Amino acid sequence: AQTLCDQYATYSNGRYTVNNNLWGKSSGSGSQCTYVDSISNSGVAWHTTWTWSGGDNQVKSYANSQVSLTKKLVSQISSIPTTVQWSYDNTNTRADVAYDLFTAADINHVTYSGDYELMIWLARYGSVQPIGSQIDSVNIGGHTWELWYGGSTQKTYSFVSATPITSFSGDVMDFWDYLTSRHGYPASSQYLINMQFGTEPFTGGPATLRVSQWTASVN
């Protein structure tokens, strides 16, 4: 496609969307550009480049790819298969690489937040930590995850890999099933309303996240 350097620059082919999404710009100084490298109904390749300083513990952006979905109750979803291959050239930073999903009881809730948020951090760089506190450790889909929980009006579970997973194939229903069966997650009254993959920088740079393939589907 082309070039996404504006704060909320965005490109979409229908099924996949790529977003620069510099929502946390004010918390510091720096700049960030995102690019669509290839896109089709079989997946999307993209990259984003950034430098950020200040606000050491605020997130500056979440450049991301996003998949269109039909909004369903989590209890009625059969699978959310996803695969991704990515790399960072500069890992001397304070950032994460993560999936981000939102659910809400109101099917028409705004799709950039919700009653619940599920994050799956494939990589944690430097002195950064998820929302809330670590409440558990669990093996899901063949990887060991720190499980973090916190938040007030929006409750956020974060599964965190202590070692970066640059090649990932999974089913996000594995994570919803675990929260449903062991942490009381109300799957039967929550609608899944958004699914994204991308990177949250805190500080560092310049660095580039190169996503050579992201695929996702909500079934």
Candidates 96, 100, 117, 146; catalytic one:
117
- Residue 145 bridge partners (DSSP): 138
Going through 13-165 in order, the beta strands assigned E by DSSP cover: 16-19, 29-40, 43-53, 63-67, 72-73, 81-88, 94-104, 116-125, 133-140, 143-150, 155-160
**Is 117 assigned a catalytic role?**
yes
Residue 200 a catalytic site member:
yes
Q: Give the CA-trace dihedral at 53, 55, 57, 60, to 10 degrees.
A: -70
The experimental method, as deposited, was X-ray
> Which tokens sit at 68?
């269109």
In this structure, which amino acid lies at residue 105? Answer: A
Distances (CA, A) of 188 to 72, 107, 150, 165: 10, 13, 21, 31
**Distances from the Cα of 95 to the Cαs of 141, 166, 206, in angstroms?**
24, 15, 12
Resolution (A): 2.0
Tell me the C-alpha distance between 146 and 140, whole Å. 10
State the catalytic residue, choosing from 124, 197, 200, 209. 200
The CATH number that applies at residue 196 is: 2.60.120.180
Type of residue numbered 34: T
Looking at the 3D structure of the chain, how many domains does it have?
A: 1
Residue closest to 85 by CA, chosen among 142, 123, 141: 123
Q: Tell me the residue range of the domain where 73 lies.
A: 1-219
CA distance readout (Å), 59 to 49, 89, 96, 203: 15, 20, 10, 8
- Taking phi over 0 as left and psi of -120 to 50 as alpha, with beta for the rest, 174 belongs to alpha
Return the closest-CA partner of residue 37 out of 84, 88, 2: 2
In the chain, which residue ranges form alpha helices assigned H by DSSP? 173-182
Q: State which amino acid sits at residue 171.
A: D
- CA dist 135 and 6 (Å) reads 38
